[PDB]
Design a protein around this nucleic acid. Structure first.
Ligand SMILES: Nc1ccn([C@H]2C[C@H](O)[C@@H](COP(=O)(O)OP(=O)(O)C(Br)(Br)P(=O)(O)O)O2)c(=O)n1
Ligand SMILES: Nc1ccn([C@H]2C[C@H](O)[C@@H](COP(=O)(O)O)O2)c(=O)n1
Ligand SMILES: [Cl-]
Ligand SMILES: [Mg+2]
Ligand SMILES: [Mg+2]
Ligand code: NA
Ligand code: NA
Ligand code: NA
Length: 326
DNA sequence: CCGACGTCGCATCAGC
DNA sequence: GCTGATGCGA
DNA sequence: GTCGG
């Protein structure tokens, strides 16, 4: 990419602030700056040129000047040589190990993949599975495999109850030629903002996908959100496909458009759009868009009949899913 | 200068 | 058990 | 770390 060196450096800084410093707003600031630089259609010549972009300030401009002049950033080169920072950044790559648990493990002398496997009994369930599939979860999914996965989910869901509608969101819905995992929005007419007329609506789908050995493991599971592991079937004498993360979100059928806007993302696009809503006097979640009163208290849900209605309320021109990859 | 920064589901833990 | 953080995740 | 009042 045009500015890949700069955006990589900002991403590494973001991950430092999140995993090591536990400064969530610094993390989002670095990610927002990397995003706006990622879509800037010129090869950046200076920090001052970049500071013109929203989300790039004085400090990142200076880092950009250091990186443009030397090809590196001293702050990162020192971070890379710090053993505690190295340890924590590695452990937080296991699903279920966040900043706090990573620092606690380092305190207990658990700092490597070998240490983690030595101490499985010190892991909760999510972490145990994240460690089990550590290699697999860092692999990307070709869109072709995403299409085979889509076919299985959609047909198995239709076998449970043909009134379900399952929609693959995330980067897949944004047209990506590869995805890091599969995100499935699910609706059923028995589950609306008004009533739940049928129980186990998510569970029944999960059970069916386990029964056919597509879903292989469960990280967390509630009434509306499943987070787990899945695997494509391989052919005779074929090497197995990697295991993949899968997220399934059951959304009230009448709130599908807010739900699919949320689950299509990206995460940064959602942050930018929800921040814009607030400046416009609305708050958006995966269910509703609502006005804010002078109170600052959210009012009653506004009528929504398309993703575009959401954009219109906040005075944004519509953006197709493929233009939301911020 | 400095308050706000997106919003919420599930797992875990502490306090009663 | 309930309730309210806190952690980690979408 | 950046931004907006
Ligand atoms: N912090 C977050 C994380 C996710 N989300 C939403 C948007 C996001 O697209 C959706 C799916 O989460 P993912 O983490 O899978 O994000 P994807 O867009 O699918 C990516 Br590009 Br990171 P992939 O999973 O393909 O690697 O959930 C969010 O709103 N806020
Ligand atoms: N998971 C889904 C997907 C779509 N739908 C509904 C919302 C709209 O009425 C319509 C969307 O049609 P389309 O597939 O063109 O996006 O189907 C749903 O209720 N649940
Ligand atoms: Cl709501
Ligand atoms: Mg995804
Ligand atoms: Mg602001
Ligand atoms: Na700027
Ligand atoms: Na992690
Ligand atoms: Na996901």
């Amino acid at each position: 990419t045009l500015n890949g060196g700069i955006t990589d450096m900002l991403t590494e800084l973001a991950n430092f602030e999140k995993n090591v410093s536990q400064a969530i707003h610094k993390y989002n600031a670095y990610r927002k700056a990397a995003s706006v630089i990622a879509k800037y259609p010129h090869k950046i010549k200076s920090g001052a040129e970049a500071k013109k972009l929203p989300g790039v300030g004085t400090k990142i401009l200076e880092k950009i000047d250091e990186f443009l002049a030397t090809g590196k950033l001293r702050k990162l080169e020192k971070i890379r040589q710090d053993d505690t920072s190295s340890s924590i950044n590695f452990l937080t790559r296991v699903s279920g190990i966040g900043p706090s648990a990573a620092r606690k493990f380092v305190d207990e002398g658990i700092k490597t993949l070998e240490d983690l496997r030595k101490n499985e009994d010190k892991l909760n369930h999510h972490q145990r599975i994240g460690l089990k599939y550590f290699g697999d979860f860092e692999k990307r999914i070709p869109r072709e495999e995403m299409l085979q996965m889509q076919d299985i989910v959609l047909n198995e869901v239709k076998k449970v109850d043909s009134e379900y509608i399952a929609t693959v969101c995330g980067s897949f819905r944004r047209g990506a030629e590869s995805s890091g995992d599969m995100d499935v929005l699910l609706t059923h007419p028995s589950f609306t903002s008004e009533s739940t007329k049928q129980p186990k609506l998510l569970h029944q789908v999960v059970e069916q996908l386990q029964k056919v050995h597509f879903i292989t493991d469960t990280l967390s599971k509630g009434e509306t959100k499943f987070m787990g592991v899945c695997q494509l079937p391989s052919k005779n004498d074929e090497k197995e496909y990697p295991h993949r993360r899968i997220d399934i979100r059951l959304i009230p059928k009448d709130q599908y458009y807010c739900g699919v806007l949320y689950f299509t993302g990206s995460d940064i696009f959602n942050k930018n759009m929800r921040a814009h809503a607030l400046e416009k006097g609305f708050t958006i979640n995966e269910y509703t868009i609502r006005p804010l009163g002078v109170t600052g208290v959210a009012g009653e849900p506004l009528p929504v009949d398309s993703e575009k209605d959401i954009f219109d309320y906040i005075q944004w021109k519509y953006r197709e899913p493929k233009d939301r990859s911020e």
